[PDB]
């Protein structure tokens, strides 16, 4: 019953290959619902979830004016930050930003976030007080002085505590059939000999929403953390996610191993074994 909204901005320079591309995508939890790409043939905010389509032309207009304004603003920030690092005009660089609001199970604001990165390193972040900044280095201290002068933290606190939360709550209602619905994993255990002495047990979770899950192997009731091969949670392309966890076990000590599954969508946490 906990929910969040995030917007992800990526601005990428490309000297010799035109002006920097600006992309913005908006999510509620693991569901994308809008995009804007300054490289699209006709750059506009586009819906990416059915429940956002009902929004009126006023809403799509508003979105598009912010993202075009940001397209320009980020092109200057890229110019600025290249200077802050005394960088050559030859190189391609990236600014990323992620911000939004986290709601608790009650629907109250748990916390706000606003972070920025430059070339994949933390650059500046609004602190949890929503009033002050943490700058990673002396270049970001320049950005900080500018953001203090324009009272940016004040403005972001107002949005994060206000509009961000109201809209997320609007979206959760309009998309309630999917956004407020958790789909439990479908699970099984596969067994493959890798030798005459040992065999791999792979525990599968499929079809789950949202992405957050915990998959653990235990031997005689204790975690095999270093011995577990854990693959990254991957999207199916139908809104759901997949994961597995494998262990290599002495043959046949297979019964001493249990796969443990936790997911928000489950009746109870699950315990599985290989069923020959």
């Amino acid at each position: 019953g906990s929910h969040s909204m995030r917007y992800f901005y990526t601005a990428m320079s490309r000297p010799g290959r035109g002006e920097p591309r600006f992309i913005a995508v908006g999510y509620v939890d693991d569901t994308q619902f809008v995009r804007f790409d300054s490289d699209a043939a006709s750059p506009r905010t586009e819906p990416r979830a059915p429940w956002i389509e009902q929004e009126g032309p006023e809403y799509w207009d508003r979105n598009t004016q912010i993202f075009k304004t940001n397209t320009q603003t980020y092109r200057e920030s890229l110019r600025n930050l290249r200077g802050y690092y005394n960088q050559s005009e030859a190189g391609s660089h990236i600014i990323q930003r992620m911000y939004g609001c986290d709601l608790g199970p009650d629907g109250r604001l748990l916390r706000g976030h606003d972070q920025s990165a430059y070339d994949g390193k933390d650059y500046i972040a609004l602190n949890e007080d929503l009033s002050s900044w943490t700058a990673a280095d002396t270049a970001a201290q320049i950005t900080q002085r500018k953001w203090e002068a324009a009272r940016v933290a004040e403005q972001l606190r107002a949005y994060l505590e206000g509009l961000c939360v109201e809209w997320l709550r609007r979206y959760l209602e309009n998309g309630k059939e999917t956004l407020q619905r958790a789909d439990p994993p479908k699970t099984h255990v596969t067994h493959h000999p890798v030798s005459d002495h040992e065999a791999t047990l792979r525990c599968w979770a499929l079809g789950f929403y949202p992405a957050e899950i915990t998959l653990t192997w235990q031997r005689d009731g204790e975690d095999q953390t270093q011995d577990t091969e854990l693959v990254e949670t991957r999207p199916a392309g139908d809104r759901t996610f997949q994961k597995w966890a494998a262990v290599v076990v002495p043959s046949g000590e297979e019964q001493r191993y249990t796969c443990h599954v936790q997911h928000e969508g489950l009746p109870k946490p699950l315990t599985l074994r290989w069923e020959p």
């Binding site: 917007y7 913005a24 908006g26 809403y59 508003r62 979105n63 912010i66 993202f67 304004t69 940001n70 320009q72 603003t73 980020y74 200057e76 920030s77 600025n80 930050l81 600014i95 911000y99 920025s116 500046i124 950005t143 500018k146 953001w147 324009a150 940016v152 403005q155 972001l156 949005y159 509009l163 961000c164 809209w167």
Partner: peptide, 9 residues
């Protein structure tokens, strides 16, 4: 809804 203010870095 996205944050409405663009600010230069």
């Amino acid at each position: 809804l996205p944050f409405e203010r663009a600010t230069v870095m």
